[PDB]
């Protein structure tokens, strides 16, 4: 059941942190591109 306990820690890690390292990962994944598709159609 520790996989969920780590999924609980990964979850709370990604929702509270906003470091520029993850910013580079967001942009490299095209996340800003996929969100800009949602704000038109």
């Amino acid at each position: 059941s520790d996989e969920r306990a780590l999924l609980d820690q990964l979850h709370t890690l990604l929702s509270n942190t906003d470091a520029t390292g993850l910013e580079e990962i967001d942009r490299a994944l095209g996340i800003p591109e996929l969100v800009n598709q949602g704000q038109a159609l």
Binding site: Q9, L10, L13, D18, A19, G21, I25, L29, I31, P32
Partner: protein, 424 residues
């Protein structure tokens, strides 16, 4: 969660004189204002790969070099990049013990080898061979004492007898340890473990004697001999037993070949204090003053630092240590050493207690000499890499992890896309 940034947590085994190490940490603290904390957990060599798999644990991990390859294979240690002026301070064979896949993964500290410790008052002339110990015991048991007590629960201590006439872990061929060729159940190892089992069947040793029982019995003068390393010398010194440290006994005319360990200090790959640890290890611990503080607590043996090893050359107990080291073999650092020690520990325990025959215990140990799924999961590497200092190499580790794990890639997308709309 996050390893504390701006301080150093150190893990070292409980028998290694952590108090002397803490003293060099206090000098590091007064010179830098950085707090150094030294801890000694139980089952240390097992706790570290479990907590560091998620990016937790200490900044610096101390252990013999044989565990560090598995730590490095699982991405738990940072690459050690010392200057040439510092690599020339330590003997090259100590650097070889911590080199893995071409990269240095730890700083060598000291070289450890088991020696025969004996009470000179009970035994003016210690036995040269294993064969004469049964008669020495029945001679000493007549006056209530006993001949030899050493730890039978860890295969590290019975390995010299097992390897003396042919036993080996993995064969070395063309600079590569042969995982396929394991010499755990050959005739030389069979005759070695049989001699230990036979001496239990004849009541010359008890199958349950461990480290505490064997050490106390020697320090209380209850046994004439024991088998241990240099860290045990200072406890014998406070017991005032007139002891000697000499070569290990021979078996079938062959010198017993202990597994040589190089105590080494690794650096956590998820530590934000990698520069502080390099400064601590190179400029404070690996000095004459730093090693003298640790050695005065519990002796280190044959230290890797050339300068202090010269100051420590004139010790007869260290000369005996190097003699047994030169007769023994350097331990492999390959990841499969974890499964090797596990297999041999089970065989020695299952043969000494009377549970399996010597041939059945070794044959089962010969089979089990292969590491199985003690590798971190796809959910732990991400947590460990995300909990590690940021770099273009660390960020690329996160991406290759997600690209090979879709539902982790899915969880990262959904959690970050929701974040990206928080700041619109």
């Amino acid at each position: 969660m996050k390893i504390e940034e701006g301080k150093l947590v150190i893990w070292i085994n409980g028998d290694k004189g952590y108090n002397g190490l803490a003293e060099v940490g206090k000098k590091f603290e007064k010179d830098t204002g950085i707090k150094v904390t030294v801890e000694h957990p139980d089952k240390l060599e097992e706790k570290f790969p479990q907590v560091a798999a998620t990016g937790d644990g200490p900044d610096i991990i101390f252990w013999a070099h044989d565990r560090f390859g598995g730590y490095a294979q699982s991405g738990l240690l940072a690459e050690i990049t010392p200057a040439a002026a510092f690599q020339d301070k330590l003997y090259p064979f100590t650097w070889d013990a911590v080199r893995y896949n071409g990269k240095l993964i730890a700083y060598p500290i000291a070289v450890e080898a088991l020696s025969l410790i004996y009470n000179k008052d009970l035994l003016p002339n210690p036995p040269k061979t294993w064969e004469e110990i049964p008669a020495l015991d029945k001679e000493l048991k007549a006056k209530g004492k006993s001949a030899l007590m050493f730890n039978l629960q860890e295969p590290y201590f019975t390995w010299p007898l097992i390897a003396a006439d042919g036993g080996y872990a993995f064969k070395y061929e063309n600079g590569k340890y042969d995982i396929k060729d394991v010499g755990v159940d050959n005739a030389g190892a069979k005759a070695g473990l049989t001699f230990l089992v036979d001496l239990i069947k004849n009541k010359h040793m008890n199958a349950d004697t461990d480290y505490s029982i064997a050490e106390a019995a020697f320090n209380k003068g209850e046994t004439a001999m024991t088998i241990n390393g240099p860290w045990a010398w200072s406890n014998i010194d406070t017991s005032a037993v007139n002891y000697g440290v000499t070569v290990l006994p021979t078996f079938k005319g062959q010198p017993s070949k202990p597994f040589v360990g190089v105590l080494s200090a690794g650096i956590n790959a998820a530590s934000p204090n990698k520069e502080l640890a390099k400064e601590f290890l190179e400029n404070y611990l690996l000095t004459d003053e730093g090693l003298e503080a640790v050695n005065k607590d519990k002796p280190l043996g044959a230290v890797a630092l050339k300068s202090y090893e010269e100051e420590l050359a004139k010790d007869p107990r260290i000369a005996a240590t190097m003699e047994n080291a030169q007769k023994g073999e350097i331990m492999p650092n390959i990841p499969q050493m974890s499964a090797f020690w596990y297999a041999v520990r089970t065989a020695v325990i299952n043969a000494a207690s009377g549970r399996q025959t010597v041939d059945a215990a070794l044959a089962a140990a010969q089979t089990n000499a292969a590491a199985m799924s003690i590798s971190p999961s796809a959910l732990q590497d991400l947590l460990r890499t995300l909990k590690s200092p940021s770099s273009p190499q660390q960020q690329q580790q996160v991406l290759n992890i997600l690209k090979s794990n879709p539902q982790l890639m899915a969880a990262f997308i959904k959690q970050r896309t929701a974040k990206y709309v928080a700041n619109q």
